[PDB]
């Protein structure tokens, strides 16, 4: 054939990949502490002899969007929201250290703090709270525990949440949705991120997802139009080859 069909076909398939990324972003429009994935087409030119005429296209995801999200006021002392460019630290699935923005902190029957089922990490490691005690979280992450039955004079600090500062260019979303330091950024900032004392959190507010609707809509419209354009090129190339095959007769 004329491999021009293999260019428009790639452009049509990567458009479906982009649509699958955008639809995934739209599905998580209500996920607490969600970071939308950025999608971008990139052109790769095929090198060779003689005339460079073919340039294929692939969909890539250049990190995520770190724009602080919406803040819903839920009058719950455990749901916390972070200052812009600030991350909470939890223990990842494989016993590693991961970063998140979901402040929906839950207390188990044994007293351990968890986020989405992952243990919460402080300066002393995972945080264990006295069993069945009221928890208040300060602006700088200090945790006060009140034991029921005892007077409010008993309120004393227990542990401090680990709050780190990381930009978009330094973190990469792992396969389980937890952000981790990229290789270059890890090599310069060390393996574990030191807690930043300047990070402030707000207790009683939960951060929503930063999925922008207007950009999503425009992206879907553009993707549909591009897919139709590639289909019209594919049809034209197929029609051309069908007659060109007549040259072999007689």
């Amino acid at each position: 054939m004329d491999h021009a069909i293999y260019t428009a076909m790639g452009a049509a398939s990567q458009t479906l990949n982009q649509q699958a990324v955008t639809a995934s972003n739209l599905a998580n429009a209500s996920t607490p502490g969600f970071r939308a994935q950025l999608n971008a087409l990139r052109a790769v030119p095929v090198d060779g002899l003689s005339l460079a005429t073919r340039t294929l296209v692939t969909a890539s995801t250049p990190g995520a969007d770190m724009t602080p999200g919406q803040l819903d006021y839920t009058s719950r002392p455990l749901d916390v929201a972070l200052q812009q460019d600030g991350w909470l630290v939890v223990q990842a699935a494989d016993g590693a250290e991961g970063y998140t923005r979901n402040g929906n902190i839950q207390v188990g029957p044994t007293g351990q703090l968890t986020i989405q089922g992952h243990p919460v990490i402080g300066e002393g490691g995972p945080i264990t709270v006295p069993e069945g005690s009221e928890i208040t979280i300060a602006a700088d992450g200090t945790i006060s525990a009140l034991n029921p039955g005892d007077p409010p004079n008993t309120v004393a600090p227990v542990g401090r949440l680990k709050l780190v500062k990381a930009e978009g260019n330094e973190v990469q979303r792992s396969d389980d949705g937890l952000f981790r330091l990229t290789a270059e950024a890890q090599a310069e900032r060390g393996a574990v991120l030191a807690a930043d004392p300047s990070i402030r959190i707000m207790s009683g507010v939960l951060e929503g997802s930063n999925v922008k609707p207007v950009e999503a809509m425009t992206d879907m419209i553009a993707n549909a139009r591009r897919f139709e354009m590639q289909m019209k090129v594919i049809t034209s190339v197929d029609e051309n080859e069908g007659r060109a095959n007549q040259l072999l007769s007689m």
Partner: peptide, 21 residues
């Protein structure tokens, strides 16, 4: 040589890098 002609040696391998090293 000119395109469509005959040469004495094979064309070099064709590769498209997504990101240059």
């Amino acid at each position: 040589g000119v395109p469509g002609a005959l040469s004495n040696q094979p064309a070099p391998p064709n590769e498209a890098p997504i990101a240059t090293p």
